[PDB]
Amino acid sequence: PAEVKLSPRDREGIINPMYDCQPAGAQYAGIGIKDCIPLVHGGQGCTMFVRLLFAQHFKENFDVASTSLHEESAVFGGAKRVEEGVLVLARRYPNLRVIPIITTCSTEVIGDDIEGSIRVCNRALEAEFPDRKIYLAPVHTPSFKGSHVTGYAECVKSVFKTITDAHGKGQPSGKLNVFPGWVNPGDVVLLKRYFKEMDVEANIYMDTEDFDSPMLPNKSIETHGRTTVEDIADSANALATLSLARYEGNTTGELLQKTFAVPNALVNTPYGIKNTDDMLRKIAEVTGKEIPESLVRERGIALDALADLAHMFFANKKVAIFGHPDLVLGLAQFCMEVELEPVLLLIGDDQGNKYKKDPRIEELKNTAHFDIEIVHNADLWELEKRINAGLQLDLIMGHSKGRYVAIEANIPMVRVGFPTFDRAGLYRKPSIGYQGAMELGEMIANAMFAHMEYTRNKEWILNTW
Amino acid sequence: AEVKLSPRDREGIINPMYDCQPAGAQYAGIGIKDCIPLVHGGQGCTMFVRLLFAQHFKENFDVASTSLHEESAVFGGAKRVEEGVLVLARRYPNLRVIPIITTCSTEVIGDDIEGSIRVCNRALEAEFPDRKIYLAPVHTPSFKGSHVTGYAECVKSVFKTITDAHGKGQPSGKLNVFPGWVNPGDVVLLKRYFKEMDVEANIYMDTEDFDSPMLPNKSIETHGRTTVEDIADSANALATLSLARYEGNTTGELLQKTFAVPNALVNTPYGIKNTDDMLRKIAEVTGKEIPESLVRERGIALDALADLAHMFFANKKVAIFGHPDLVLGLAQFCMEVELEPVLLLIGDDQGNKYKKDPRIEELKNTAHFDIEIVHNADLWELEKRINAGLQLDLIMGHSKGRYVAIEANIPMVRVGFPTFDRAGLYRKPSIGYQGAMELGEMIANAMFAHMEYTRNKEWILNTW
Amino acid sequence: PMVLLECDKDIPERQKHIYLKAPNEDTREFLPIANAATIPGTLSERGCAFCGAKLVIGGVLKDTIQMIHGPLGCAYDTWHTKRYPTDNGHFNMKYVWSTDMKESHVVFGGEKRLEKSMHEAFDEMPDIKRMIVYTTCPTALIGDDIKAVAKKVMKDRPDVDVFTVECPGFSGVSQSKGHHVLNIGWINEKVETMEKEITSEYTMNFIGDFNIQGDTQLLQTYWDRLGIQVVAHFTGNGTYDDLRCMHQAQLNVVNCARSSGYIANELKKRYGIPRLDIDSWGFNYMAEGIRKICAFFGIEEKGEELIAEEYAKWKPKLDWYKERLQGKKMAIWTGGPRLWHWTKSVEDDLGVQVVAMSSKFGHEEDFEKVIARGKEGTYYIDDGNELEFFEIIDLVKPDVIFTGPRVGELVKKLHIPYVNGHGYHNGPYMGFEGFVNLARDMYNAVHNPLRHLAAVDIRDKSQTTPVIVRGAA
Numbered sequence A: 001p002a003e004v005k006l007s008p009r010d011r012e013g014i015i016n017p018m019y020d021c022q023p024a025g026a027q028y029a030g031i032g033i034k035d036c037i038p039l040v041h042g043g044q045g046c047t048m049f050v051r052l053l054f055a056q057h058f059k060e061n062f063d064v065a066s067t068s069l070h071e072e073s074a075v076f077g078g079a080k081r082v083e084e085g086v087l088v089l090a091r092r093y094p095n096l097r098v099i100p101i102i103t104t105c106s107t108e109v110i111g112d113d114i115e116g117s118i119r120v121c122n123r124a125l126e127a128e129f130p131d132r133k134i135y136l137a138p139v140h141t142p143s144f145k146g147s148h149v150t151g152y153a154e155c156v157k158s159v160f161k162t163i164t165d166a167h168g169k170g171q172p173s174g175k176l177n178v179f180p181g182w183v184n185p186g187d188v189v190l191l192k193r194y195f196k197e198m199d200v201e202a203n204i205y206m207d208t209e210d211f212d213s214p215m216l217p218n219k220s221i222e223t224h225g226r227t228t229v230e231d232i233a234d235s236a237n238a239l240a241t242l243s244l245a246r247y248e249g250n251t252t253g254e255l256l257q258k259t260f261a262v263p264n265a266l267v268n269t270p271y272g273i274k275n276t277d278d279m280l281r282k283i284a285e286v287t288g289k290e291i292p293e294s295l296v297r298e299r300g301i302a303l304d305a306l307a308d309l310a311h312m313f314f315a316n317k318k319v320a321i322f323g324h325p326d327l328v329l330g331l332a333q334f335c336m337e338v339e340l341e342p343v344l345l346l347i348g349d350d351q352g353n354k355y356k357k358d359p360r361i362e363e364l365k366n367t368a369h370f371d372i373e374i375v376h377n378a379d380l381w382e383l384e385k386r387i388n389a390g391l392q393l394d395l396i397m398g399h400s401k402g403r404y405v406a407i408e409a410n411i412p413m414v415r416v417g418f419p420t421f422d423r424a425g426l427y428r429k430p431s432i433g434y435q436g437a438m439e440l441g442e443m444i445a446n447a448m449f450a451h452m453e454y455t456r457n458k459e460w461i462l463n464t465w
Numbered sequence B: 001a002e003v004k005l006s007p008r009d010r011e012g013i014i015n016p017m018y019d020c021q022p023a024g025a026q027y028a029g030i031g032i033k034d035c036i037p038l039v040h041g042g043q044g045c046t047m048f049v050r051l052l053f054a055q056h057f058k059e060n061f062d063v064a065s066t067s068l069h070e071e072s073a074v075f076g077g078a079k080r081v082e083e084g085v086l087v088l089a090r091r092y093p094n095l096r097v098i099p100i101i102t103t104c105s106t107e108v109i110g111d112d113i114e115g116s117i118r119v120c121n122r123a124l125e126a127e128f129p130d131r132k133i134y135l136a137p138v139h140t141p142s143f144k145g146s147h148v149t150g151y152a153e154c155v156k157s158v159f160k161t162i163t164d165a166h167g168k169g170q171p172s173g174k175l176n177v178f179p180g181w182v183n184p185g186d187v188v189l190l191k192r193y194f195k196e197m198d199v200e201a202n203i204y205m206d207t208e209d210f211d212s213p214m215l216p217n218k219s220i221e222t223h224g225r226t227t228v229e230d231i232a233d234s235a236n237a238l239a240t241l242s243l244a245r246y247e248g249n250t251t252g253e254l255l256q257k258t259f260a261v262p263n264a265l266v267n268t269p270y271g272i273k274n275t276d277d278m279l280r281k282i283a284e285v286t287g288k289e290i291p292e293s294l295v296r297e298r299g300i301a302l303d304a305l306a307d308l309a310h311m312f313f314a315n316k317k318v319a320i321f322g323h324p325d326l327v328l329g330l331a332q333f334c335m336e337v338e339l340e341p342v343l344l345l346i347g348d349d350q351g352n353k354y355k356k357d358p359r360i361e362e363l364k365n366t367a368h369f370d371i372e373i374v375h376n377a378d379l380w381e382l383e384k385r386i387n388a389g390l391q392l393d394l395i396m397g398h399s400k401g402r403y404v405a406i407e408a409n410i411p412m413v414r415v416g417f418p419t420f421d422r423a424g425l426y427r428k429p430s431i432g433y434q435g436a437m438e439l440g441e442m443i444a445n446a447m448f449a450h451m452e453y454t455r456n457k458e459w460i461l462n463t464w
Numbered sequence C: 001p002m003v004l005l006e007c008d009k010d011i012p013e014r015q016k017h018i019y020l021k022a023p024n025e026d027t028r029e030f031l032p033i034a035n036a037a038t039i040p041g042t043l044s045e046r047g048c049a050f051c052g053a054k055l056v057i058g059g060v061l062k063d064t065i066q067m068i069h070g071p072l073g074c075a076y077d078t079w080h081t082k083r084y085p086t087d088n089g090h091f092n093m094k095y096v097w098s099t100d101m102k103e104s105h106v107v108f109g110g111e112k113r114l115e116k117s118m119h120e121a122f123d124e125m126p127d128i129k130r131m132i133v134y135t136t137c138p139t140a141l142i143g144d145d146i147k148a149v150a151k152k153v154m155k156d157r158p159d160v161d162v163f164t165v166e167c168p169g170f171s172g173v174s175q176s177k178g179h180h181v182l183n184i185g186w187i188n189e190k191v192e193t194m195e196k197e198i199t200s201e202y203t204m205n206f207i208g209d210f211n212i213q214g215d216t217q218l219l220q221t222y223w224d225r226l227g228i229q230v231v232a233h234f235t236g237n238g239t240y241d242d243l244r245c246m247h248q249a250q251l252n253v254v255n256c257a258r259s260s261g262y263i264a265n266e267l268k269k270r271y272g273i274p275r276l277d278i279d280s281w282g283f284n285y286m287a288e289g290i291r292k293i294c295a296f297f298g299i300e301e302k303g304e305e306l307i308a309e310e311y312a313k314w315k316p317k318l319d320w321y322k323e324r325l326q327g328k329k330m331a332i333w334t335g336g337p338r339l340w341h342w343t344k345s346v347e348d349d350l351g352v353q354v355v356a357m358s359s360k361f362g363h364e365e366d367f368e369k370v371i372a373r374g375k376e377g378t379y380y381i382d383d384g385n386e387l388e389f390f391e392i393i394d395l396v397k398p399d400v401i402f403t404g405p406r407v408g409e410l411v412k413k414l415h416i417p418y419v420n421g422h423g424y425h426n427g428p429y430m431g432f433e434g435f436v437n438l439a440r441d442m443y444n445a446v447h448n449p450l451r452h453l454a455a456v457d458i459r460d461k462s463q464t465t466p467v468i469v470r471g472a473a
């Protein structure tokens, strides 16, 4: 019988890392907050390289500051660099409200007391700016543990703890909290539409829609996170939390349940049809609202489109998928709905104890008719080496830092997850939901079609399908 | 420095760009609710066109044949029309509209379509007293024009038929909109624009539901949404907005002559300026302001195109083929993003009209590179010019040109009709601001994949 | 005078870093402070010392494992970000290596973790025999002895050669310190450890060129035409072993005197090899450079044949661009040297006015050079930050900004176009052809319909949408 096997990378070192380090993910969490400038306590590269990474994915600038740790502070302590950095930010950015103070390998190794610096800064800020409130959140993100996925989740949780500690529980809002995880602006646009069509009030944490900002006649800069202090504080007042990503915000939903008795509902990340269906069923359950006819229609249009592709072009084609764990596991399920065979799943960090318990692994074990290898703690050399050793793949799905693997092996690749810098506009295209499943399926087919043309592999067949 | 119009220099065609008139008339008709066109001619004239629509849309559309056979070629085919109408009416109880589309055969033999319509009207009134079926005569000989002209003729004839029957009533306050031959995605964009600008409008024909769901209840919803009532109400509109000179403007003029509904023909809204000017015309005729939401969509489109234009597009040479409104509009879009459309191919015998198109002058006054516009073109014209040394970086056209691009190793973006060799393109807008953005990003993504397959500076796709 | 910008009222120390050149001043009284500590919290453009070693210099090499001893982020962050092709399939851009430091290694030491990672890298790619190992913030802090580990690996693997760099990010103040440590370690440890065959009467090293979009390969067409053997390129399209041979050259030609002046200085001191500084950007600059190289070697006529052919090929296109770019205003916000390589070359060859310049990490030497060559009324900024860029834009109103892509994407919102002053748009930009490439991208950036369209508010009844007529050389 077919076997779904979990295995670790068998090397100590990394070649071609799948993810960045924790502080990068904490920066990504923070840039989704309005009137927020994260402050990365460590050497300058820890900031500047991540600002470049976000420019690669989004083709936009995001504001993140460094504490500029130098030799003196590496030897004698960096608290004064934190403290000066906070004050320089507040003095030069009058509308600044939130500063996640993100540690790095350096400042974790030397043991700077971030909570003590925050007390110093709160004192200093209260004296200098008696009419402002600036929220300083301690974010402990040593890069020698976890990855950007864990750092994202840690920063969301710390910021929510900080803001809700200050505000507490108050008037019930009647809204859902929604933690979609690390998704694109197009994913956020699709979720907002779903809630609007279902007549469900919701805050999406973080609201990154406006990362795709206009070039306007008045030259105004609108490239900002839309989640406010007020939105975050109101999370204590929600009817329920819908957590879409076990590794990308569910721990914040759990904290709000523990602290404020907001019930948390973790569902499978909504990649593919069944996972979207079950997300909408959970929203209906928690809210008492009906699923609208408009979503039945969108679902039906997606199924119509995928039916043009599945047995003709996808059946029995083997796929490798890499990316964030919620995305890898969700896309594996989507692939099987359209008769693709996801034979190799690669997840890129040290969280294997958690992944072994993910219920979607069992869901795959109970459905797959082909062997699946799930490599955890994987790097992208694990994919390249397996292709070199003879693994036959028809498709790769992953982010752009794997591009050379696909190019050299002459395998079509669909760009998913983060970062997708080597194609245009993908941050605007949904991947989740019904429309997203349709868009993903058509991206797969179109990549295969172009490959058939370039390789002259039955290219004449693209006429009467 | 020179924009030159020239005809194809061969009498024959190799690799035709367009189908014949009746195919275009069929396309017009399938956008009407409770309509089954009846194509009066041999069986291939129907079945091949139903297949063409299945290629583009991946859907069935209902069109019937009169099944002209040998006896009718000797004695005339009127009885095949008359039978075909009754057999439709008897077997499709909800049928309301039958455009009766002629073909080369039935134009050559001179069947009297209007005489057959009088017979069928009498028969139908006697047999179905509580039913009204509108029979529209559509004269579409294939030995002139093309599916473009046939589209325009059918729209006009259906509108004449239905408005003749109902005449002028109470003012509707709505616009009439003739977008021309566009995709369901283009219709979805236009509906959003009118909704955001608080402008009531009928879009003729409304083909949104051609992209129909596969539903739990097994219902078939693959239909045109434009009704008899919607067409009849065109007489009562505030104004007509015609987006396509060759694809429905002549119906806008007919409604202006017959019912004093003022027609406004504008450049087809490919690219930013043409979209801007369309919206200004809507504002002028309705008195409604252009909403902030469209300033923002425009700005998002410009932001995206600005990531592409000087880095990847500037000085790249483009050939474009397709319907004349699409070719001329895409040439203007290309120049906005620094592409150089050096070869425009338009596929039919309407050169005496194209020579007067104001967009030619807009190109002659703008371009800094020679442009050759070949009218009465086939797709061999493109292939032969490439074989003779024309250097192109991009082709934009429909899927029947695919082998030209494949063999020449030139990236190609699929636009216009039919686009059967890629998935989902009928759902993606090409017009408007979002459409300009989507077109530009298809261009870039086609270039990017080409760079990877050909190992042409493929390392550069990192920090653009 | 020196300038206190409004956005710097609460960090008034920045006045000593910003000079506005005015008539009759003795510029010796107005030299910006440079290469001093960064102010925390400013959104300085600076990067780290590790970046200067691995990303900028060592990582250019085509045949060398780049083993980053640290947690995974420093590796991730230096991969898919540079444009330095090679003639072996771009090995340097396809791969990055990390020791994947974990907490246990912080507590108990990372030397065995490095040693294992090095053996794995050599085992996974048996045809690669050269490696540079870099420290990062935490491996520096815990005192791992990477030289000792490298020596043990070399003993156990006689096929390999390893170089080590101690370059944590907090060293120095910027990328600059990584340049220094790498240069000095390379000449102390690896120069004079190999020789190559000398195949010309005329030999040189080309020092301080990193093959951005093929710059080095373009310049090599000149050296091949002139019959000059390049012993080593430091480090564009280079090999580890070529760099071991640098002591053999007769001449060191320097372009990037900031990153690579150190090794030229030490090669002159130790081996007597003269240092010749040139500008390998700029059309008339390139000619001067070739004439100096040829005068040194006594091959003046060969140099004049090359120059005459290159002018005949490229000068008419360059002059077409000058006609359309004359009087345009440019800003240069890059590392430092391109400010002094470009301010007077774009002025001389394209008629372009550089109105504002910012250096991430330049030294006072770099400011001496740029202010010598630059214009009056121009701003000269050491260690510029984001709010300063906005205020400078208001002051000088540039038509184009040469800067990195993220800042380009920021100033786009202000309808100001950019050219990538680091990785180029459509390069190479060095040499005669390269300056035409640079001019073409500048031209297409500013003469761009999208800028004009973005300015139009379609709600304004008084406004129309314009059409802009462009050109091509």
Ligand code: CLF
Pocket: A021, A022, A023, A042, A043, A044, A045, A046, A047, A049, A103, A104, A105, A106, A143, C048, C049, C050, C051, C070, C071, C072, C073, C074, C075, C077, C135, C136, C137, C138, C167, C168, C169, C170
């Ligand atoms: S200033 Fe430079 S890039 Fe920064 S750590 Fe230091 S050498 Fe490196 Fe590394 S793993 Fe991530 S990115 Fe940092 S927190 Fe550490």
Ligand code: CLF
Pocket: B020, B021, B022, B041, B042, B043, B044, B045, B046, B048, B102, B103, B104, B105, B142
């Ligand atoms: S039954 Fe067969 S396909 Fe029909 S015409 Fe006759 S041989 Fe030909 Fe031709 S041009 Fe068009 S498709 Fe017709 S109307 Fe004439």
Ligand SMILES: [Mg+2]
Pocket: A304, A305, B057, B058, B059, B211, B212
């Ligand atoms: Mg369908």
Ligand SMILES: [Mg+2]
Pocket: A058, A059, A060, A212, A213, B303, B304
């Ligand atoms: Mg943008």
